[PDB]
Symmetry: T
Subunit: 161 residues, 12 copies
């Protein structure tokens, strides 16, 4: 038992209220993006429908895994996520997705904007998150990388060169 600690209770790392708040911000925008992505997935029509229909689902898959990652990271650090519809609608920074069928060209522009809004939130909280807990900042890097890839894969459709 030469280097063994003799403490009965050893407590875990606990997130500050600011840290908890910062992850909550990322969480709602990821959930909103997932909901908007599905709306777009269902209602997109027109030229190159199928590619967009499929890509939007991949976006949703990524944003859903992201939300679970962030929420469970909060839980791990003794913070409490709120992913409820009312909270998401009232607190998301994403511009509202429009109703009804939308052209593929419209959907490309709309969804690129909403991905970029989500990335902006993560980028905005990054430094404060990193200063408190570098391990969580690494989860943010995964999200930034994955989402910016989605934006490129989606926006390239509308690029005229």
């Amino acid at each position: 038992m030469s280097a063994r600690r003799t403490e009965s209770d050893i407590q875990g790392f606990h997130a500050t209220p600011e840290f908890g708040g910062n992850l909550q911000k990322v969480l709602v925008d990821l959930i909103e993006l997932s909901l908007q992505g599905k709306q777009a997935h269902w209602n997109v029509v027109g030229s190159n429908f199928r590619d967009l229909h499929l890509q939007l689902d991949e976006l949703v898959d990524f944003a859903r895994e992201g939300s679970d990652t962030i929420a469970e990271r909060m839980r791990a650090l003794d913070a409490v996520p709120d992913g409820r519809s009312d909270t998401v609608a009232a607190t998301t920074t994403l511009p509202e997705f429009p109703a009804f069928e939308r052209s593929t060209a419209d959907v490309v522009d709309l969804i690129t904007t909403r991905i970029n809004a989500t990335v902006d939130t993560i980028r905005r909280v990054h430094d404060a998150v990193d200063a408190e807990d570098p391990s969580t900042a690494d989860l943010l890097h995964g999200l930034i990388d994955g989402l910016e890839k989605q934006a490129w894969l989606i926006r390239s459709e509308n690029r005229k060169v």
Copy 2:
């Protein structure tokens, strides 16, 4: 030759009432999935792991359910609305509470909200079936799957 002569054969299109009925089912499935994840993350206490896991299975089912309904709407020329504001403003499910909740409370809460979701589907069933029996089969799969989830979750709290 029995070949038809038309160059533009149109498909079955749903009435506004039918589309509205599927929209009702859609928002409650989306709401259930969001509440399911909330519960999944925030449940604590005796038998946490089983409940944490079962709730993810519920969410998986409700998400594929929502996709099925929304895409059935699209197939029949209806237009789904699964946006957060719409879901919040039009869902019939009792609001799930914020914060950590005990496994026993989560069992009771989620069972109620699953039953609320099944109730929506059962309420619209006959009107859906009358117009399009094929869509009612999709509703049957939902009723079956969700009622199975209700049983698997609620049994935790049963007395004898």
Copy 3:
């Protein structure tokens, strides 16, 4: 603004005693079919042994999945299944499978008859089940379809010209 319900306790659909009894009838015949299917699977000998040996196992798989589906549907609807050996033996409508080895030709006829009997139970309770709960009748349709396919695949061995 809000369409949210306000009850703290919302109850699930509860099957009538009659409905429960009807599903119980299906259950015992499916279990009996599974047990007879294995008996036949072990004890068949003669011309085209292997095919029947293999097909019988597929029948047993389907009947076992079937019994679990029915029993769990009962549980979902607050009914209580009884799949115990004594109950199955005492209440199954299937003719007893004979003892010892049986020829491929005999097993074909015997098992086809027992599938037909199992399906007849499902068809007999169908309308009463459908009237109370259309979602359960759909599970019955899957059973009817899957079992009648098994009957075709098995019986065709003995069909001539």
Copy 4:
């Protein structure tokens, strides 16, 4: 004690009218698969690849469907006929044109062919359902899957 004592119990036999109704579904599903492959090979132009791929998924679904219907016929002791001459002579689908066809034309052509196939299933539905509800459920699966394919394909040409 509840055991039935007859040595041979007969199964459910389809009437010949039922058999003929499923035969109508079968030939159109087969025709659709053959037309689907024709389109899959010969489609050219803007968004070729998506169409090429989606057409194969349609064919996969129609082939599984024709197997399902033919085997259901056999299960009920009806006898299917999926031979080329019969399919050509009795299909209700408009003929697919020869040669390379643009993606836009293929979209419209195949949507029409799918809609014709669904129409056949919808036309026989009630007579099939009246004799055998379990078979009608298979028809529901086909209606659901084909109408989904129609939506996935036609959306390419939709202007909003």
Copy 5:
């Protein structure tokens, strides 16, 4: 040159006593599977899900086991009897009770049923081993797997 020259070489035949010993194992394995499913459906209460799941794993093991024993009988030209009437009439397992049962009760009941099944295998072991060591190895696999299941289930009720 070392080749045997007889046209038919006979295989190893089990004595009827050996066959009867394996028959004893078979009925108890089948009874256990049927009781296992009964418990799996009807268990309710604290830690429902773990028990529900573990009971299915037990049933899987007992079903594979009964197949192994019945097929070993056939390999040695014995003839198994796994029919409902025979199983009910000849199983050594205490009857499983009807109705919903609490998780605590199910734990104790099933542990007893597993232990009865293992006892049968242990009881016939030496007579089986004396005639055919290869069959005794299958019995060892069953003893090992069932006693593992007994430990996994009973641990739920263990107070320390």
Copy 6:
């Protein structure tokens, strides 16, 4: 320094009308074989039903993969396949499959004959195809090999002693 070609447009290999017609002949017989294979698969009854039922589906799988290979090879070489039902019926060299149920023994003989006919078409066009395009003849070799294996696996049911 550099071996780079400087043309901005380099054309692909274009099949002659004769070559296209030869592959078209293969195509229709493969599709016809697939259709007859399914007919036999559904409608075979009698001794050893299951084996033939199963083997026929493997034949259909191979013939379907075959037809796609040939049709796509045509497309690659700027030829245009015709796999429509009317064309297949009007131009196939296979004897018509008879209607209604057929015995296992009859199905064995019938299907073996139709595979033999399909292979004969491929063998008949082989040398002309090989002369123009050796790479396409290799695809023909795969078809010949795979189909003659199917013929062996099917026909051996009826071969005595």
Copy 7:
């Protein structure tokens, strides 16, 4: 404090020459069975061809896995296997498989006899093997079990009523 052994060289279990010879006897019969199994698999014709064709390949798979197990067990215990064609032919106890095509019925009887012979070798050496090394006898039990199952699945074709 410490129960650690202090030898720098600890030797493994070394089989006696007799033990090695006993496993060699098993080995040659397993290889011979594999070779005869393939011969039968290629050359069987007649009623229920496909089932026997398929089952024979499963037998060959088991016998091949068996020969590798035995040969490697020999190697583990510092014995040296001989699986060369000349040795197998010169020392196998199996009756020779006859040449050319054989009927399904004949193949059933022939192969059953050869499995019985293979198992008899294993049963003959069993007690001597078990006495020296119980762990090796367990591998023998797996072989006996798996081969006698093959014999049942094959022979049952010819068993009447």
Copy 8:
């Protein structure tokens, strides 16, 4: 060869003795945690046994992959791990796991404490590791994230709310 280096030997990044020491600290606590996790996995009894039994194995899987990651990172950086039992026992910071059967409630508290001790070690060395080699700090972030998730999944069992 315009930007090509012309050096025969190009050496890799080598860890300082301090860095090597820091990774060694993480290594022994990960190994100790794996050994304690297995002890808990085997000996846990009581209410919710199965969930805990299963979760503890997932913990062990993660801690074992972690130890291999750390040890091989050491090797990559020309450092030498010591994962031997004596070294692990003499140098681990984890409180000793108690002997005998332990209740699920006890195991939850015990294992949460030991996970937290392991995380503390990683958190303690993090800044020094990051200052020398950011790529290795990222491996530490994976470990922190994964272990703190395990702690949350385990400790939630004992939480009374």
Copy 9:
């Protein structure tokens, strides 16, 4: 005994001309794969996703192709050279341009470069076949696969 008596049986070795012919194929396959990735990354515009995806499939095929040829060279005692300087200095493919390129331009560019690669293989085919028919079969697989890729890519730009 028909057993051969030699202790050192040597294998087939390729002529310098043969090795040089396979080297020609090798550099064009490597170049195609590098250009394929360049296009995959830098393509933009209408139907980006389909082209992005198809180009990766082309690259996959060309990379396995290059490995096949280089390893066939090794089997026959030839020595491949797939180094960047060698590929750049000896490839027959027109250089792929830098920077972003439209999907329409990428279709035309990549089709030309696939055709250039096929041309190399077709040019060396007869000399390869004359020496070693087994290697010509590998060439046939390449011609078939690449010409399929050309068709799948170029069809995007087709008019009617």
Copy 10:
């Protein structure tokens, strides 16, 4: 009815001697796995990769082995102790050295330590078999697997 009447049928429980014998096997398997990983990480020199890989396969086998034994102890009401202090203080294996070691030295070292582990199992075998033949079968699997590992590792150092 042959049904047993007992409500509480107990399972087979091991003697203290038996539990102690399995404990002996357990600590040597755990020690072998720790030494296996040490060797896996620290081996260098000629044929490094093969040895690195084989040692992981050894570790995999020893870890599943330790779990099998410890869980067999639990099934029979024995209590394993796999803690680091216990393993270090009670293992019979010669200590594996620290630091980098050549492949040739690693081969010799690991072979010795595998043989030490097999020796433990062989030493306790008869006493285990006498009490519980089913557990001896688990020991046979261990002896077989580890002796296979010894052969695969040691053959590297063999002379002719």
Copy 11:
């Protein structure tokens, strides 16, 4: 209308000379597999594991090959003979030596055995190709795969 009207159309029959040519390939492929396993078991020394593993891949390939050839014979109504006595009596491969052999010796021995097997295939190639080009393609696959194995194995002994 283009339908042939004969009731039985005969398939392609191999001449007996063709059959005998494939028989030559078959026995050498079988001999190679048996020698491959002999080597796989008995190889010892430096780089044991790589050789042990590579020899099994060779055996896998040769076994698939012998099946391919024997089944091609059957497809064309030739009748294979793969019996031990026939293989020993008619194989052209030099006998594999008894006992343990060093990795260096095994490398050289097996390379020779592979080269002998390839020589047989190359020797019959033109006669096989003249009668049936499709069979020659199978021979090409064998030549390609075996010569790859020869390169992978012999490279171990190559000094540069």
Copy 12:
């Protein structure tokens, strides 16, 4: 819409020309390494050929995935990769791989050097990349970690202790 942004176009993060240049440097060395790895894979001969042959392919797999990661990260950040053969040859920092067959000992030393050169490039640009975009630095950490592991796995072959 309480926190919702009301902007039509929200732009993504764009890499500076320096950042783009820095990723381009990493890209060419990863591509060069993949090409050299394959050259080595094909042409390596001598003692322990197979292990090296196999390890070199794993290296190539990793370097190819790396190049795609870097290139697509550039695309995501509105930078434009150049992976063309001429560019790679003219701008790589890796010493040229020699022609012809090379001994396993030679290949080990050669490839270790070239991996180390590639790692050096990534390490050289790391701080500038991290300062501008921490999410991209994390991708570099993956590359450093993965490549240094390959170097250790390859170089250990030549280590004499």
